[PDB]
Design a binder for this molecule. Sequence first.
Ligand SMILES: O=C(O)c1nccn1Cc1ccc(O)cc1
Ligand SMILES: [Zn+2]
Ligand SMILES: [Zn+2]
Ligand SMILES: [Zn+2]
Length: 231
Amino acid sequence: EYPTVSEIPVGEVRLYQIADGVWSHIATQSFDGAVYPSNGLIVRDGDELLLIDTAWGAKNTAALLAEIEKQIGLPVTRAVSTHFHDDRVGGVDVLRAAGVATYASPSTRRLAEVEGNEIPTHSLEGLSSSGDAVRFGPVELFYPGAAHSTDNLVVYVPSASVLYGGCAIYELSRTSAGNVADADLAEWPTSIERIQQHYPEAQFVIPGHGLPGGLDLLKHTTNVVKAHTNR
Ligand SMILES: O=C(O)c1nccn1Cc1ccc(O)cc1
Ligand SMILES: [Zn+2]
Ligand SMILES: [Zn+2]
Ligand SMILES: [Zn+2]
């Protein structure tokens, strides 16, 4: 069973194997009195690991590295942050001090610097235009267009048919929008459409928060976004 927020003390990290050589990591963080679960991804690349997104803070990200060594035992050599918010880049300095090469799009690096969030060291080129895709080792990176944020990327694992949608995709159990201060409401459903059209073969779909599912998370997200648009 997939872990939920009441099962994870803030400061601890769970791993959940999705497929051969593909895990999610789950952590929790408090914000404005409430506690929120958050996902990232781990993809085996030969005898090293590619990390997708931090565990939302320095403390959680150190625990993330320790759980990975405990349960997997392979080195995390590169990390990709899928947008500039703290649940994606919070902990980047911990990754760098551990010798992880940290990556993000120029768009994400630029926004992180303006917000005051931690800044991934390396730039991911070739992703500035909606529909752009580039290979990054064992995954494909895809920029669907602005949605939850103007810079959000999605990540696809072709060997396992795992689509990591990040925060542009909502879990089915989430029926209201949430933190859309930085969203492009007008373009969000169009960007989701681009994800559908580019990865129709996806078997598993991982949201940035909550329970994985299939491609029906995409239509669900469109519904929730349109309802918030019509407030
Ligand atoms: O929406 C987001 O992307 C986000 N990032 C940090 C906090 N949130 C809001 C949230 C709301 C409900 C949840 O189950 C989980 C998260
Ligand atoms: Zn976000
Ligand atoms: Zn988020
Ligand atoms: Zn729904």
